[PDB]
Design a binder for this molecule. Structure first.
Ligand code: F6C
Ligand code: CLA
Ligand code: CLA
Ligand code: CLA
Ligand code: CLA
Ligand code: CLA
Ligand code: CLA
Ligand code: CLA
Ligand SMILES: CC1=C(/C=C/C(C)=C/C=C/C(C)=C/C=C/C=C(C)/C=C/C=C(C)/C=C/C2=C(C)CCCC2(C)C)C(C)(C)CCC1
Ligand SMILES: CC1=C(/C=C/C(C)=C/C=C/C(C)=C\C=C/C=C(C)/C=C/C=C(C)/C=C/C2=C(C)CCCC2(C)C)C(C)(C)CCC1
Ligand code: SF4
Ligand code: SF4
Ligand SMILES: [Ca+2]
Lengths: 739, 139, 163, 45, 80, 29, 42, 31, 135
């Protein structure tokens, strides 16, 4: 009976090595710790978010401190296209002379790392020009992290620790988060853009000792309150304006040209300030929707139980029974966590899908490796958030769901036909894999036997209609913003498409990624992607809806979320838990984003190298994906160190091979299972006891690690090997052809 | 207590380890009418004696693995003891002197639920309570 | 209520329970220093105390000593200072042990003393302490001497200059 | 002593230290007992 | 320290007791069966967790559940 | 029973779908 | 170049802290963190 | 113009403030 | 879409005709690809324009969906043909080929068979006929 772990008693009395491991993996499941009340649960959720916010701020201050200290922001900012950003310095005391010389790069006088995060472009756009501005930002974020470490400690003191009623005050939190956390913050950000970022992109230096005196507009503070709002967009930046200088600059601070800045190939800063200003007002308005304590507002609980639609008998919102859902969502933390992750998983996919097509930061479209890494980062982040959104759906069904409160509501109607949903995800998955693999390997066979004209090539004429419906005149659909005489193009009653000449100038220019040209090769991958999103939804939906149990074991709710099996009886129940559907869907999530990011990378690697006709003519069959993408672009990655030398890709060539090993060692935890290793550890335990001079002896008996743990240990290696291998590929295959 | 002659066995590697004399240890005691050979639960083969046999095993599963082997020699008079390191010897199998397949009087329904397994309560009912859904004093 | 209590609950004791002497962090640090760590022979108490001191005591003489001007001679002057300070210190605790442990130590080393801030009350415990303090402060002095006289060779290998 | 020496070599060649890798030019590991048999099997003719 | 609960759906088929490798189960007299028996689990600290008792129970959605709980030195079967 | 709320919300979404196809097939402007 | 240097200010500081946090401090840290996970609850 | 020699040490002692405030909070959450 | 032009007028596709052996495969089929909407790379493609191809994006779909239902209907109707015989346990491992053939000739006119399955309320089993799980 050890002290550790103190949160669970029955794991502290574990005599084996699984209690050190299970303590790590249970240490944050506060709702299952011994002697926990609901009141104490939230007060530890709350106080560990402060400890999390501080880590984000200490991480962010580490970005700033290291480019202030060891970066080349001053050198970079004078030529953001031809010099590489420095991440930090290298101190590996076991480099040879070949690695010092190779990694002494980008105008540095010491080994350094090339920043592929884009923070240089982000800071250059938001108005940071000196290293000292970066340093005081780093110091401020350290102290801002301090006031959240203190606040977290503060709200565990009994006199400051909030009560359960404060946490379950859903209407008051939504009102402030909409109005203040998002509304005021985006209003404040438009304040920075108007006061600092926009003026400093026109040359004038605005700082903390300067900003109180110089107004951002000549008509400041008076055109707003009179109502003469148009004064803020009188003369905008011209098309010959060059960034961070006064030549070509205007005076408009809130103007809505749309499209791209012709010199940075990014969105206009004045167009962003006007954006967050509009978003703020919409968000602040949205934050006055729910009544807090002023009996003017909405009550979410009553918006559920309402059954009267202007006197007409209805069953609830949208004529669907939502009664009891307020007390279901409000008391469930996993329902709330599932919704939050699902909404960050969309906001992070949406981040990736928009920041490549519509680059926000200056000169980021000309930094291909940064642009490529940022997409792959946020899509992989979004894939994990989507898996966790459906993980906590499965926890929600098991632990904090009851049929009594939710009797007859919209949530209980889903369980009534959970097999109709799963059977249909099964059909779509089967449909999309038979006719995408079958169409790829038909194209393989025809190209293999020379008859490349016998490929089945389906033009994606529906997405090409979208592009034509947004402005792309390339295809010739000639409708609806491709038709200059249409109702939508002109907006006949008002003609207020001030955004349209600038946008159509950008969408119809072929040198950007905004609405890329789409061909038959793009058709097939969007069905691989659709097949991917459907199977990994099928695995997760099956795991959430069968978390309560199915005919193979109808009592899964009693066994918890993560259990191995229910023995070999009834045929065998390996991987039966709802946890094993989250485990099984990480493979499909990684696979699917290994199709999204492979397709994003190869499509852009063909545009960037000018060989666009390589992707269009060879992405329709699977060998082209294998010869023209993987085999072709590995050449300079694997030659990062050869017998004849070593270059700046020697670390990417090493992590590429590192991730192959981390991937392969995953198969050990995934293929060979527990009882093999226990009979082998039982033998090594015999050898240690019987041998002389071995004076150590285990405090806790060595056992082969458990069933649900190896599935997690092997899933971590598969993931780390999936990310180190592709991270090294994507960085080295893009930052070797180019700068 | 316990006593008996140990079977003819050349000693194995699968036998007792340091857990035997430190945590606790088991002993199976049976009587055989014949001098035949049985399979050792710790690997190998040993010749069981003519009178009272005594064998020391590390865990209870081995003893009942061996006990199930003795029933194939038509021997059902074996007794399994549990030797704590301080030295006292408990009788644990068969606990009442008759084999557990048989039904006695005086044994009690222990860990019996008076409901179908289907109507165990949902985990939300026992939320933030000491009990689990399967003890559940309702029904 | 108040954070400053009477010392272990006895108001008549001449001390206070304060965040510096009676804190969960401060008690955990002091009571695991080698002077107070539970489970150490007095030799390992002194050995770990000695090496911490012999190590740092060669410093203040090799860079602001009289020999600091040269390189090979500076390290000798710093080592012997740690040799002399420790030998005279270990002379001090051999004669401390002789003169306090003489039948009924007048003070905190009496049999009925119940003092936690000095738990070595035996003269079987103060003799292994002397050996540990000595051999520790000698090895620490030599290790800090070897690391300093080889500083150019050590500066290269923590800079990768040796490939 | 077989695979992890491949990860030693993989790391010295990446560092740019080919003279401290298990090469024919770095730290040689010669098959002494197999080059001996190759000598035995050709002098017996 | 597992938890082998027995439910009222037993038929006294006695098969669960025979499959147990560690003698956790035994029969007690009862009245809800033609057999007049029901399984009981008096020795569950000895339960190793093999669920071999659950494979032998013939009642559909079986009457005996092993509930794998706090695992100790004799519920994991360690000879060392 | 005749479905009156499932219908007229399915036929409403087909309507929006058929309008989109109307611009797609170059029928209405 | 043939050495690890630093053009940045306080370039002596990686010289000592890369050994500190990576192969001098962790074994004390893994010992302290070991004494915490294996203490009797008496 | 990179940051000065002293500015690195100023950040070192400033970052020691959240270094101890993390101890404040980690132990208050009862490690 | 207007980027696609017939292989009649396509410079990248007459080049396909020029350097083409015959042997059986690149003349008789390749003449028939001249009527297809052909990209800017000399590759026949499947576009969805209007009535121009409204019959050609119905010949494969009508031929498949009929014979997919034909396989499905004969396979389905043979299953109920042996469930009623109370011999379906071994009637499936040993295919009763005269019964299966007679279930195929019922499946020639399967589109009109499914309608009177549906209109009789007999195609689809009612919801509390079907074994399900606890839910
Ligand atoms: C103390 C304790 C102890 C001791 C003593 O005392 C021991 C010993 C033995 C002997 C006798 C033998 C032989 C040796 C050799 O050869 O090789 C080496 C190895 C090693 C490991 C070595 C080690 C040694 C020691 C440990 C050293 C020390 C270190 C340091 C101190 C650390 C540092 C500290 C800080 C804090 C970090 C062994 C072995 C085996 N192991 Mg064995 N150990 C143990 C521990 C452990 C753990 C934790 C684990 C997990 C990882 C394992 C595992 C294992 C496996 C798999 C195997 C095998 O295979 C082998 C065998 O079976 O045979 C046959 N095992 N082992
Ligand atoms: C104005 C008042 C206000 C403000 C500024 C906050 C702010 C915060 N609260 Mg608090 N809260 C408030 C009032 C307020 N609260 C009240 C009155 C209550 C009582 C009910 C609470 C109860 C409460 C709890 C229980 C918790 C918080 C938490 C938090 C923190 C959120 C975590 C975070 O920072 O992530 C990031 C912040 C962002 C702004 C991220 C922005 C990016 C998002 C994800 C995307 C935005 C895009 C947008 C939605 C696009 C759509 C817009 C639309 C127009 C199209 C945050 C600092 C959490 C916490 O404790 O942290 C320590 C938490 O656990 N609050
Ligand atoms: C293959 C997909 C992919 C790609 C291309 C990237 C790319 C990037 N990531 Mg990453 N990341 C990913 C997946 C990916 N990520 C996933 C799935 C996770 C969740 C674990 C993370 C979590 C993550 C974090 C926490 C950070 C990044 C950061 C970055 C940026 C700088 C690192 C770099 O130069 O590239 C190199 C290519 C790589 C594959 C390395 C990526 C960095 C790894 C994934 C960090 C792993 C976190 C790990 C749990 C903590 C280490 C343990 C610690 C105790 C030592 C870069 C744009 C950094 C950033 O935000 O920029 C300032 C950063 O702080 N990512
Ligand atoms: C929360 C965000 C925020 C904050 C704190 C400020 C703060 C300030 N603004 Mg500003 N402003 C903002 C958002 C913000 N603004 C946005 C979104 C716009 C676009 C409409 C403007 C456009 C604006 C103009 C045109 C001017 C100010 C001015 C000022 C300064 C004096 C006004 C005052 O009431 O005192 C003051 C420091 C005035 C000033 O004196 O400049 C220094 C002034 O000329 N603001
Ligand atoms: C805001 C996001 C968020 C939050 C607060 C939670 C919170 C929680 N989750 Mg979780 N989850 C999330 C997102 C989140 N999740 C996402 C995005 C996924 C998809 C992957 C999951 C999938 C998931 C599953 C399957 C489970 C949980 C569980 C839990 C609960 C227990 C936490 C725990 O296991 O202890 C602490 C966890 C750890 C200490 C993690 C161990 C180490 C991991 C694998 C990281 C390893 C990275 C590696 C070291 C990096 C390599 C370094 C270098 C070599 C590159 C807890 C309430 C468990 C639960 O619900 O309880 C019943 C549960 O089984 N979650
Ligand atoms: C590449 C992936 C991979 C790796 C590294 C291993 C490694 C291993 N396997 Mg495994 N295996 C694998 C794939 C892998 N396997 C797969 C895919 C399967 C599916 C069938 C199996 C099935 C399998 C079975 C059935 C068995 C093994 C066994 C073993 C162990 C053999 C003993 C040994 O080689 O010592 C050497 C260790 C290595 C070669 C690992 C790499 C060592 C690196 C290079 C050194 C690390 C340096 C340093 C320690 C790093 C630490 C620094 C610190 C910061 C952490 C070993 C650890 C056998 C065993 O258990 O042996 C007793 C065993 O019976 N494997
Ligand atoms: C989390 C942000 C972060 C990250 C990822 C790094 C990373 C790094 N730093 Mg550091 N550093 C940071 C913040 C960060 N720093 C801040 C805010 C300061 C100002 C005091 C410093 C000052 C600093 C110096 C002087 C040096 C480094 C150095 C380094 C490099 C080697 C590792 C090391 O010795 O650091 C040592 C760590 C510190 C000095 C303290 C940093 C710890 C921060 C403040 C908090 C990190 C804790 C984290 C949030 C909690 C996560 C723990 C766990 C959950 C994973 C490495 C790339 C070395 C280098 O230059 O490489 C060539 C170097 O000597 N850094
Ligand atoms: C005549 C027998 C028959 C019939 C009428 C069906 C009919 C159906 N199946 Mg099914 N299936 C069958 C046999 C059959 N199956 C066999 C033998 C297997 C094992 C390979 C499957 C495995 C299967 C899966 C995994 C799924 C279906 C699904 C479906 C449904 C829609 C998808 C579809 O068109 O078929 C799908 C057809 C296949 C996957 C291949 C089987 C077709 C062969 C050629 C059967 C011919 C046998 C011959 C006539 C005798 C549909 C009602 C899907 C569903 O759940 O409904 C929404 C679904 O996910 N089937
Ligand atoms: C309070 C505190 C602090 C401080 C600390 C200090 C004060 C420091 C230190 C330190 C030190 C001061 C350390 C040291 C050391 C050492 C060592 C590590 C040693 C050694 C050694 C050796 C190893 C030796 C050896 C030998 C011998 C024995 C004999 C022969 C010779 C030779 C040499 C071999 C701080 C604030 C920071 C924080 C935490 C708490
Ligand atoms: C035409 C067209 C199109 C479109 C399409 C769509 C959009 C659709 C849909 C549709 C729908 C919306 C559907 C469906 C459904 C529902 C249900 C409900 C069903 C069903 C079924 C069944 C019932 C079946 C039956 C059968 C048969 C028939 C035979 C075999 C057997 C069985 C039983 C399987 C595309 C573009 C592609 C192409 C071109 C033109
Ligand atoms: S629990 Fe199962 S095996 Fe045991 S008596 Fe009841 S029905 Fe028979
Ligand atoms: S799990 Fe095994 S030991 Fe436990 S009661 Fe069932 S059969 Fe007996
Ligand atoms: Ca060498």
């Amino acid at each position: 009976a050890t002290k550790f772990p103190k949160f669970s008693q029955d794991l502290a009395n574990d005599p084996t090595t699984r209690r050190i491991f299970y303590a790590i993996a249970t240490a944050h499941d506060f709702e299952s710790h011994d002697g926990m009340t609901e009141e104490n649960l939230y007060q530890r959720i709350f106080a560990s978010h402060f400890g999390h916010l501080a880590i984000i701020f200490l991480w962010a201050s580490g970005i700033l401190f290291h480019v202030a200290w060891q970066g080349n922001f001053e050198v970079w900012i004078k030529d953001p296209v031809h010099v590489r950003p420095i991440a930090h310095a290298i101190w590996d005391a076991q480099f040879g002379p070949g690695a010092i010389k190779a990694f002494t790069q980008a105008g540095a006088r010491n080994p350094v790392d090339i920043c592929y995060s884009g923070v240089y472009h982000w800071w250059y756009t938001i108005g940071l020009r000196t290293n000292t501005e970066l340093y005081v930002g780093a110091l401020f974020l350290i102290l801002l992290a301090a006031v959240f470490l203190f606040a977290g400690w503060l709200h565990l003191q009994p006199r400051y620790r909030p009560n359960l009623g404060w946490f379950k005050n859903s209407e008051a939190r939504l009102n402030h988060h909409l109005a203040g956390l998002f509304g005021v913050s985006s209003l404040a950000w438009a304040g920075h853009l108007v006061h600092v970022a926009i003026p400093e992109s026109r040359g004038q230096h605005v700082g903390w000792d300067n900003f109180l005196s110089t107004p951002p507009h000549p008509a400041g503070l008076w055109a707003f309150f009179t109502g003469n709002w148009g004064a803020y967009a009188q003369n905008p930046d011209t098309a010959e304006h060059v960034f961070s200088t006064s030549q070509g600059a205007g005076t408009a601070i809130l103007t809505f040209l749309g499209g791209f800045h012709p010199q940075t190939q990014s969105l206009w800063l004045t167009d962003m300030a006007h954006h967050h200003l509009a978003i703020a007002v919409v968000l602040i308005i949205a934050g006055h929707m729910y009544r807090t304590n002023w009996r003017i507002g909405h009550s979410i609980k009553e918006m559920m139980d309402s059954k009267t639609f202007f006197g007409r008998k209805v069953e609830g919102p949208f004529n669907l029974p939502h009664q009891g859902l307020y007390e279901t969502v409000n008391n469930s933390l996993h329902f709330q966590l599932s919704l939050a992750l699902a909404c960050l998983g969309v906001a992070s996919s949406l981040t990736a899908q928009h920041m490549y097509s519509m680059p926000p930061y200056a000169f980021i479209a000309k930094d291909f490796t940064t642009m490529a890494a940022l997409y792959t980062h946020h899509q992989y982040i979004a894939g994990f958030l989507m898996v966790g959104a459906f993980s906590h759906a499965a926890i929600f069904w098991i632990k904090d769901y009851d049929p009594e409160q939710n009797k007859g509501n919209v949530l209980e109607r889903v369980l009534k036909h959970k097999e109709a949903i799963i059977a249909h995800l099964s059909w779509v998955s089967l449909f999309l894999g038979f006719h995408t693999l079958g169409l790829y390997v038909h194209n393989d066979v025809e190209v293999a036997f020379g008859a490349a004209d016998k490929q089945i090539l389906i033009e994606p004429v529906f997405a090409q209609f979208i592009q034509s419906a947004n402005g792309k005149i390339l295809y010739g659909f000639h409708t609806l913003l491709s038709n200059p005489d249409s109702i939508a193009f002109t907006a006949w009653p008002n003609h207020a498409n001030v955004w349209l000449p600038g946008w159509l100038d950008a969408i119809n220019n072929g040198t950007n990624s905004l609405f890329l040209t789409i061909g038959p090769g793009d058709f097939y991958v969007h069905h691989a992607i659709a097949l991917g999103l459907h199977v990994t939804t099928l695995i997760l939906v099956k795991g959430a809806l069968d978390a309560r149990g199915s005919k193979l074991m109808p009592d899964k709710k009693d066994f918890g979320y993560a259990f191995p099996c229910d023995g070999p009886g009834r045929g065998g129940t390996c991987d039966i838990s709802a946890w094993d559907a989250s485990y099984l869907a990480v493979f499909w999530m990684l696979n699917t984003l290994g199709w999204v990011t492979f397709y994003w990378h190869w499509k852009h690697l063909s545009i960037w190298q000018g060989n666009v006709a390589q992707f269009n003519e060879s992405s329709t069959y699977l060998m082209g994906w294998f010869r023209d993408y993987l085999w072709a672009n590995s050449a300079q990655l694997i030659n990062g160190y050869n017998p004849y030398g070593t270059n700046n890709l020697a670390v990417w060539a090493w992590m590429f091979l590192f991730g192959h090993l981390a991937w392969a060692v995953s198969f050990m935890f995934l293929i060979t299972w527990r009882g093999y290793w226990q009979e082998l550890i039982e033998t090594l335990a015999w050898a240690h006891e019987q041998t002389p001079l071995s004076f150590g002896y285990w405090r806790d008996k060595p056992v082969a690690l458990s069933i649900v743990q190896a599935r997690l240990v092997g899933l971590t290696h598969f993931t780390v090997g999936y990310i180190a291998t592709y991270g090294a590929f994507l960085i080295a295959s893009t930052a070797s052809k180019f700068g | 207590t316990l006593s008996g002659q140990t079977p003819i066995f050349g000693g194995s590697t699968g036998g007792l380890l340091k857990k035997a004399e430190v945590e606790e240890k088991y002993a199976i005691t049976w009587t055989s009418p014949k001098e035949q050979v049985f399979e050792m639960p710790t690997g190998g083969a040993a010749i069981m004696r003519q009178g009272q046999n005594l064998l020391y095993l590390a865990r209870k599963e081995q003893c009942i693995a061996l006990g199930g082997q003795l029933r194939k020699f038509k021997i059902t008079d074996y007794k399994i003891y549990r030797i704590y390191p301080n030295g006292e010897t408990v009788y644990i199998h068969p606990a009442d002197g008759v084999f557990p397949e048989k039904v006695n009087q005086g044994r009690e329904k222990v860990r019996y639920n008076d409901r179908r397994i289907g109507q165990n309560p949902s985990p939300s009912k026992v939320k933030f309570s000491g009990i689990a859904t399967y003890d559940a004093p309702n029904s | 209520n108040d954070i400053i209590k009477p010392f272990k609950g006895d108001p008549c004791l001449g001390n206070l329970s304060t965040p510096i002497n009676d804190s969960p962090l401060a008690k955990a640090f002091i009571n695991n220093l080698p002077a107070y760590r539970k489970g150490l022979t007095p030799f390992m108490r002194g050995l770990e105390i000695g090496m911490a001191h012999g190590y740092f005591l060669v410093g203040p003489e090799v860079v602001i000593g009289p020999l600091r001007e040269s390189a090979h001679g500076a390290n000798l002057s710093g080592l012997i200072t740690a040799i002399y300070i420790a030998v005279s210190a270990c002379l001090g605790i051999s004669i401390f042990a002789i003169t306090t442990f003489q039948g009924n130590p007048k003070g905190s080393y009496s049999s009925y003393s119940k003092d936690s801030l000095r738990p070595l009350r035996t003269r079987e415990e103060w003799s292994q302490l002397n050996g540990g303090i000595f051999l520790g402060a000698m090895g620490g002095a030599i290790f800090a001497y070897l690391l300093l006289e080889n500083f150019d060779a050590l500066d290269a290998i923590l800079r990768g200059a040796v490939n | 002593h077989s695979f992890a020496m491949y990860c030693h070599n993989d790391t010295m060649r990446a560092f740019g230290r080919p003279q401290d890798m298990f090469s024919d030019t770095g730290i040689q590991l010669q098959p002494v007992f197999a080059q001996w048999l190759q000598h035995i099997h050709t002098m017996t003719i | 320290s597992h938890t082998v609960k027995i439910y009222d759906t037993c038929i006294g088929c006695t098969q669960c007791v025979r499959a147990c490798p560690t003698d956790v189960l035994e029969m007690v007299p009862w009245d809800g069966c033609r057999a007049g028996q029901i399984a009981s689990s008096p020795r569950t600290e000895d339960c190793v967790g093999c669920k071999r008792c659950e494979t032998a129970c013939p009642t559909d959605f079986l009457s005996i559940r092993v509930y794998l709980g706090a695992e100790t030195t004799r519920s994991m079967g360690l000879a060392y | 029973p005749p479905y009156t709320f499932r219908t007229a919300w399915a036929l409403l979404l087909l309507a929006i779908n058929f309008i989109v196809a109307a611009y797609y097939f170059h029928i209405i402007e | 170049m043939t050495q690890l240097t630093g053009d940045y200010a306080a370039s002596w500081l990686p010289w000592i802290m890369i050994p500190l946090v990576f192969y001098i401090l962790p074994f004390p840290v893994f010992a302290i963190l070991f004494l915490w996970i294996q203490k009797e609850a008496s | 113009m990179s940051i000065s020699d002293t500015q690195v040490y100023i950040a070192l002692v400033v970052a020691l403030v959240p270094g101890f405030l993390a101890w404040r909070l980690a132990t208050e959450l009862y490690k | 879409n207007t980027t696609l032009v017939p292989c009649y007028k396509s410079p990248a596709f007459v080049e396909r005709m020029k350097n083409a052996p015959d042997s059986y495969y690149t003349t008789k089929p390749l003449k028939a690809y001249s009527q297809l909407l052909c990209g800017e790379d000399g590759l026949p493609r499947i576009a969805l324009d209007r009535l121009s191809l409204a019959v050609d994006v119905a010949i494969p779909i009508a031929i498949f969906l009929y014979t997919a239902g034909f396989i499905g209907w004969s396979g389905r109707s043979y299953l109920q043909a042996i469930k009623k015989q109370d011999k379906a346990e071994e009637k499936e491992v040993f295919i009763d080929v005269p019964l299966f053939i007679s279930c195929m000739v019922m499946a020639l006119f399967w589109p009109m068979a499914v309608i009177k399955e549906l209109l009789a309320g007999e195609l689809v089993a009612k919801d509390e006929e079907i074994p399900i799980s606890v839910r």
